[PDB]
């Protein structure tokens, strides 16, 4: 059936080439480019004493959770730089952290292969482990809450999982990646999510159906980062091959490539602005590069980190970008 | 600041105090990455020192060791090998009696050792090499020659010289002046590997301090 699979791939790529009526690069020639994004670090969040691997913004656009290898999960009041909580993780080898859209839970995980859910709002004043989601046989690289009771986690066991937090059970398993799955991105309607993995492919998953709707293969190296466009009809990846690609769900094709000659290091994190015209990618060359998502031009550079920028996020109100990094510092930019 | 903002700032300051205390207590730990290939004697030396990552805590002669057994991560190491970028030493386990086995076990061990020595995150990380099952290797070396694994040996067929050649093959993968490989031969029964790890870690710290001063 290998010949049938190869024929199906060939005819699918022929169908994709059929839809290539006009590249996104051509359409946006006659539109005004953003001049030059020059953002400035507004807050610097200090208190992580090791490498920060993940941060997530709260939906209130003021609280953010960060995960670092010092075994502490810190929730920051990014307006005042106050530390709302310092959550000591049972396993210090955290690789991902999520903040619930409600704000009542944070999740984290890593080399322990467990998604630990933390109840931020308990009757007692402590943040305690609400649930430990065991069942992944590889490290957890990403996790995102659907709501207070559902969280989707990607793993190094090449499979993503949808969890019922209350019962601690894998509601759905998202198999189909051949390499380590490195990132997740929920669509704004949370009816479907993309996941980029180490097979240099990003697969579009239906949360309810539990099956891969589409597979996107433009990258050459391991995809470390993925993020939907704000409207949910597109997403952008970030891989080790020093390029970001914008894939459209409906067009089922890569629309734009965000690469520059002097950039050779991999991309650890990608995110969009509120309008989505800016693609903010964090690179291993210690800085975050802002790209005009409609023209693939480096609008700006977020220099200011002294190590690999591992994580970055944009607030839901789009006011600020926070970039974590391996230098143990979180910086809010605006 | 408001009164509630004042109390929130005070709580944040207490949180920073606790984070500082924890980081101070954590910087005094010697972080060891236990690494190897399956049937190698990783479990034996862990049992001597005494999910997805197993962490072994043991204090030996006033020095605290955090030994990270990551053997349950059957995934791409390079996607998490950077989490151990700051370990004092990598404890690499090799089954000496793996030249005559296939899964070639010893060639796989050499390939893993090379990929770990020349990993970018481990350029200056020394390695406490353990040549395990030396009794089994001695039993198998008088019958099975060291030619199943190494065809270009062109040497004798005794236990000592064959094991020295194996250790030399492993040490030849270093290709760096700023790290050392502290090869030790273990028989899965001697209660000394803790002292060997301690001595190698002591030597690594001393050599690092000498390097800082320009004395190394």
């Amino acid at each position, epitope marked *: 059936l290998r010949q049938e699979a190869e024929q199906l791939k060939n005819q699918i790529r022929d169908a994709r080439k059929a839809c290539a009526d006009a590249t996104l690069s051509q359409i946006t020639n006659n539109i005004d480019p953003v001049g030059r994004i020059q953002m400035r670090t507004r807050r610097t969040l200090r208190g992580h004493l090791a490498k920060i691997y993940a941060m997530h913004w709260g939906t209130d656009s003021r609280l953010l959770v960060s995960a670092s290898q010092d075994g502490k999960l810190i929730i920051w009041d990014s307006y005042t730089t106050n530390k*709302v909580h310092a959550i000591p993780l049972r396993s210090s080898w955290v690789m991902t952290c999520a903040y619930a859209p409600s704000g009542n839970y944070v999740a984290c995980g890593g080399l322990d292969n467990i998604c630990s859910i933390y109840n931020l709002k308990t009757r007692e*004043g402590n943040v305690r482990v609400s649930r430990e989601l065991a069942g992944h046989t590889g490290y957890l690289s990403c996790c995102r809450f659907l709501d207070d009771n559902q969280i989707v986690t990607s793993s190094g066991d090449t499979t993503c999982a949808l969890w019922d937090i209350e019962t601690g059970q894998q509601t759905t398993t998202f198999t189909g990646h051949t390499g380590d799955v490195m990132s997740l991105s929920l669509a704004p309607d949370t009816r479907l999510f993309v996941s980029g993995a180490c097979d240099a492919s990003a697969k579009l998953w239906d949360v309810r159906e539990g099956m891969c709707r589409q597979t996107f293969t433009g990258h050459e190296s391991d995809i470390n980062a993925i993020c939907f466009f704000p409207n949910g009809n597109a997403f952008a990846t970030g891989s080790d091959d020093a390029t970001c690609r914008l894939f459209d769900l409906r067009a089922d094709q890569e629309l734009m490539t965000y690469s520059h000659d002097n950039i050779i290091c991999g991309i650890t994190s990608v995110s969009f602005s509120k309008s989505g015209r800016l693609l903010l990618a964090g690179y291993d060359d210690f800085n975050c590069n802002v790209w005009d998502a409609l023209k693939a031009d480096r609008a700006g550079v977020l220099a200011g980190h002294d190590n690999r920028v591992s994580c970055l996020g944009v607030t839901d109100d789009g006011m600020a970008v926070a970039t974590g990094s391996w230098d143990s510092f979180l910086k809010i930019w605006n | 600041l408001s009164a*509630e*903002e004042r*109390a*929130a700032l*005070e709580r944040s300051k207490a949180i920073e105090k606790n984070l500082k205390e924890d980081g101070i207590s954590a910087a005094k730990d010697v972080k060891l990455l236990l690494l190897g290939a399956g049937e190698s004697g990783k479990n034996t030396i862990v049992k001597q020192m005494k999910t997805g990552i197993v962490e072994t805590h043991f204090t030996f002669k006033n020095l605290h060791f955090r030994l990270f057994d990551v053997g349950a991560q059957r995934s791409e190491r390079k996607k998490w090998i950077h989490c151990f970028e700051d370990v004092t030493a990598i404890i690499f386990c090799v089954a000496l009696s793996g030249y005559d086995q296939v899964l070639n076990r010893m060639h796989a061990s050499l390939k893993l050792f090379d990929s770990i020595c020349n990993n970018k995150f481990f350029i200056d990380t020394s390695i406490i090499l353990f040549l395990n099952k030396k009794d089994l290797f001695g039993e198998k070396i008088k019958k099975s020659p060291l030619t199943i694994c190494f065809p270009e040996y062109t040497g004798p067929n005794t236990y000592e010289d064959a094991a020295a050649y194996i250790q030399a093959q492993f040490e030849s993968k270093n290709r760096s002046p700023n790290k050392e490989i502290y090869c030790h031969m273990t028989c899965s029964t001697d209660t000394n590997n803790i002292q060997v790890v301690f001595d190698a870690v002591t030597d690594i710290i001393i050599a690092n301090n000498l390097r800082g001063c320009g004395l190394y």
Partner: single-chain antibody
Amino acid sequence: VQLVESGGGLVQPGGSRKLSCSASGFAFSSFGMHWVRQAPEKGLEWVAYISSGSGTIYYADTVKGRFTISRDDPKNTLFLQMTSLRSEDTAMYYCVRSIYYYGSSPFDFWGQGTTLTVSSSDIVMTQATSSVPVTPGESVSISCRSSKSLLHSNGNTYLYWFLQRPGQSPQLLIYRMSNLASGVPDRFSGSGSGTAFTLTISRLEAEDVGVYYCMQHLEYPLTFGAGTKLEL
């Protein structure tokens, strides 16, 4: 979550007495803890505040010097050392949980209190109405006014609403003006602005019958408005 105050009883005027509240079932060391007293027929009056970790301590000017608040975190006990107990120190003393981070809910839990009987620029919170008679199923609004604007430059208005039910400890209803407390049914609403505030009950039950108190948490000499007792 429990807070069991201990002490009280008859004390001769000018004497001394130690009030202890044994916290149970919560992370007592991470909570700022208060003493709030209430004279046998008067409203609530905040006595003292010891922060989490004993870092910051405040007293009411009517007890400052005579009173000393302390906490025993390993034993989860909050103390009030009272000296020179005047006749106006005759009140039920409630120990109050309070935790302060962004979005927290201070004053959420109150202890059962102890009756202490003494033998023979503060913001003025003035909820002027009192003894409001209401019927079940009706919607009642409870007014509150502040001498100074409780709204802070940060956007937060530090007005609290409590429910002294008959024979029961106060219970937080609305912690920061228009913020509904946990476990409080969403028939209470917080409204108002600046210096004037209103607490609305959409459809009051027999559970809602009690005395409703304002409290400001802007400047630390916390003050209450004399309770607007709701009666059937």
